[PDB]
Amino acid sequence: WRRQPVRVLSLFEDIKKELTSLGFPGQLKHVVDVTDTVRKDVEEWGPFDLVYGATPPLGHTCDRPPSWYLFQFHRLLQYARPKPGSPRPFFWMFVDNLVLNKEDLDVASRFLEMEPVTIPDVHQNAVRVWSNIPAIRSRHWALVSEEELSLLAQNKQSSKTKLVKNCFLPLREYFKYF
Amino acid sequence: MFETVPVWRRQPVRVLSLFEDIKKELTSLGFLESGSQLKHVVDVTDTVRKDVEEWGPFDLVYGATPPLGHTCDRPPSWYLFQFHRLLQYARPKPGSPRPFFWMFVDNLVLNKEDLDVASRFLEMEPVTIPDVHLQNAVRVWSNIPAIRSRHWALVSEEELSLLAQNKQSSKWPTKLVKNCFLPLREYFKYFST
Amino acid sequence: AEKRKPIRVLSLFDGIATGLLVLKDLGIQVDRYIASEVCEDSITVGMVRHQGKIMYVGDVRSVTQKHIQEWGPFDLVIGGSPCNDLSIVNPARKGLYEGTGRLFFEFYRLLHDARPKEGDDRPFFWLFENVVAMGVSDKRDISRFLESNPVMIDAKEVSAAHRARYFWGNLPGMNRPLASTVNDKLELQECLEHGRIAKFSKVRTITTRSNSIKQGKDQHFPVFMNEKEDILWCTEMERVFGFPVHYTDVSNMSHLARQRLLGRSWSVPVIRHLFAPLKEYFACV
Amino acid sequence: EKRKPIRVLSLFDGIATGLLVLKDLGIQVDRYIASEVCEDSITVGMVRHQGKIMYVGDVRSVTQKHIQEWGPFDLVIGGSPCNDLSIVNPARKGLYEGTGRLFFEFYRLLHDARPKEGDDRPFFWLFENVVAMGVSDKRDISRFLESNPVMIDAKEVSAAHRARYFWGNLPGMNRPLASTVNDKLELQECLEHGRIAKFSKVRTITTRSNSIKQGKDQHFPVFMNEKEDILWCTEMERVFGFPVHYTDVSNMSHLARQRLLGRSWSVPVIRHLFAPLKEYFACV
DNA sequence: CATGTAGTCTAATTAGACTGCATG
DNA sequence: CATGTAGTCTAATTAGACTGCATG
Ligand SMILES: Nc1ncnc2c1ncn2[C@@H]1O[C@H](CSCC[C@H](N)C(=O)O)[C@@H](O)[C@H]1O
Ligand SMILES: Nc1ncnc2c1ncn2[C@@H]1O[C@H](CSCC[C@H](N)C(=O)O)[C@@H](O)[C@H]1O
């Protein structure tokens, strides 16, 4: 009803070009590389209430194994979580541009407490998000079969985003709009 | 020490002969009387110690393996072990001072391994006795001093195998082997004429 | 006052149950020892030698947070992830983020779940072990995710073998100096079966591979027996590691199967040194 | 007055079962001279008895002169190999060839060790072999030892069938064998924790792994968490009566250890035959 | 620069059929 | 009638001698 501006932490990913175009002295925190960030460094930066991370898309620009991004994401997410004495809302958001394999996917859903949802793009390109936000978990979306998802990944790996814009919309009502 | 005593107190030899009879050879050199006490047994399998003792005391125990032929129904080592067994049955108690002799003769049928279990069980190495122009040979184990001391013609082992190879390939020992029983004459009564 | 209570233990990658063996010999009462392990040889050793006290819960990746919250609360959380993909002795190591290396994060995951979080100041202790001979970058990542720096403890100081290892944890007195004792076999000669002569006082680090007995790169045997040199027997390795002799003589295992279990486990007197301060916190017999 | 410690000659000693039984009956042992050539056998005895056993190698190397200097002996024990006597071997060579003739080495050294006639001192001996031998092989052993054997089956004081022949002169060799309160008569009592036995008694344990299997059809005698399994070395030691882990030496595999147990004596059987000896020689 | 909670490869050992039949 | 202090065969599977180099 009466809301405050949002404070977003983002890893592995430049988000501000898509954030404020959805309607949000900048309150973003982007960290160059998180092998060296410790607990107090994360909370020395302002208390966030939506942490965000993601893997790079399907391009040969990987100094990391694919699961390095989630493990580091899971680590700093626990740093930014507020104690149960926090009355404001809090969410998180990690997603993979289909870099992870089946063995990496099972580990992802074990560490993130959630089964991911797949979003497609009608034209294609698809994307795989875990996050506690209640809207996308219950959002009516056109489902895809999982062998067509990597029949389309093999076709996208041979030739080697507004898809996230539809998902970040439900954060409208919890934080001041522009 | 097998001492010799004067002539009048020597007694007729009492012979236990196993696997082969040597009655026709002993009296040929006069060890028994003409006509009708040597004890000969072929199959010694169920011979017990009591049997031997009631068979009178013995002065000479003799055994021989069958000559090279078809006559060896038993394994060749059987003749030695059974000989050792019965020999200990026939020994007198270490009190009496009479002369007691024993002898085992091999007609070239025991192989290298059986020869070594032979000398281990009789506690002496064998002597080889030849015949001359190399007709025959025998290996002899015995406590008769004149056998283990006589200097027989040397016979290496490459010749004894050739003799046994064609003796078994073509087929009773000689009469020159009086030197096998000749040393016993001085100890027992001599019968001739 | 308030009497102390029996300790409740979550053991990850339990192996041949070194942790429970040490707690019992320190006289600490154990109410429950819940172990995650998958090697059937490992489990058979633990079931037999502790007579069915251990609760085996299987693959560490099947243990969920709700299981942790109901099986608990836990007072002690111990583990030592596989090192075959971290130790530089393997030139085909897959690093920390792939292979059996990533199993470390399962320990990190469950350690966070068993923690008494904000508000609860009940005593809580944890211990994670791994090798020193790992990559520089993999060492810093383990300590970043565990938010603590390792203490290096070598079993050469309280046993007859070299074994340099890293220990992360919050056990009281972890850096406290290592102290020889009456029951510690410091010399190889005290570890040999009767009639065998030790060449040296120490052996090199024992691993699962049978070349660990040999004293050097130039191949070697540490024992004299009769008229020939000889290898160290697996029964003598048990005494070098500090285990009761014939501890791993179970289920017709070969000496290589048994050396495979020993060469992976903890050195008992090192663990005994680290667990000993827990006697003040929990009920003892 | 004064009993003296026992002086023992043990031919084909194996894993030193005789010495083990003498110690646990409490009989002080002066000398224990053992003939043996299996290096795994020699290692067990050397380790398990801390160097008390004097090993002298091949029984065929032992002369009467050796028995004179090593002696005198109060007890002579042995059990020569049976792999050329037992009918289970279709290729057996009999008593007079192969390893069968090693029996005569026992008969030989037994004679070499007997006290000279005129001596009254106690002298005991014991020879064991298998029941499942040819009828004429049994006859020839009895005529060379001048004794008939007693058949003792370990199934009356142990968890395993093991019918063996025993020649000797120990006091009361033929007396009824009674189980004592320390015998484990059923397979369950010899298993490690958490394991359940199907059968109460196992058939004869030989060196071969098939012998654990029950019947013509293979059969596993133990249940472990609803799964069938075979016996472990540890459990086989307790079936035989040895201390658990007695053969856990020299990195021996489970087949190598079974090879040693499969050739040895049932301990509670030997315990019953040696028990009247503690009146003849010094106690603990 | 000696060391190592390993892995890879190929002579060696081991599970599992079979063989055998005298003996009580 | 089943059993047996074994032995001979194989596949299957281990067991012992090699490669590899980052690190303190
Ligand atoms: N996925 C998994 N879940 C549970 N345990 C596992 C596992 N993968 C491997 N392990 C076990 O983890 C152990 C690591 S070695 C640690 C042994 C233990 N510290 C001891 O003292 O004995 C190995 O025994 C291995 O069998
Ligand atoms: N020539 C020889 N000299 C001495 N021992 C021999 C031998 N040939 C075989 N042996 C040994 O004789 C043993 C026969 S089995 C007897 C084992 C013994 N009764 C026990 O209780 O363990 C075997 O261990 C074998 O190694």
Author numbering:
A (entry chain C): 185 to 208, 215 to 313, 318 to 354, 361 to 378
B (entry chain B): 178 to 213, 217 to 313, 317 to 354, 359 to 380
C (entry chain D): 628 to 912
D (entry chain A): 629 to 912
Pull text from the paper.
Mammalian DNA methylation is established by de novo DNA methyltransferases DNMT3A and DNMT3B4, and subsequently subjected to maintenance by DNA methyltransferase DNMT1 in a replication-dependent manner. Among these, mutation of DNMT3A has been identified in ~25% acute myeloid leukemia (AML) patients, which gives rise to aberrant DNA methylation patterns and increased cell proliferation, and correlates with poor clinical outcome.
To address this question, we determined a 2.45 Å-resolution crystal structure of DNMT3AR882H–DNMT3L tetramer in complex with SAH and a 25-mer DNA duplex containing two separate ZpApG sites, mimic of two CpApG sites. In particular, the catalytic loop in the DNMT3AR882H–DNMT3L–CAG DNA complex is well aligned with the corresponding region in the CGT and CGA DNA complexes, with residue V716 moving into the DNA cavity vacated by the base flipping of zebularine to stack against the ZpA adenosine (A6). Nevertheless, due to the different base ring sizes, A6 in the CAG complex engages less van der Waals contact with the catalytic loop residues (V716 and P718) than the corresponding G6 in the CGA and CGT complexes, which may contribute to the reduced methylation efficiency of DNMT3A on CpA over CpG. However, unlike the DNMT3AR882H–CGA DNA complex in which N838 forms base-specific hydrogen bond with CpG guanine, the equivalent residue in the DNMT3AR882H–CAG complex is not involved in any contact with DNA.
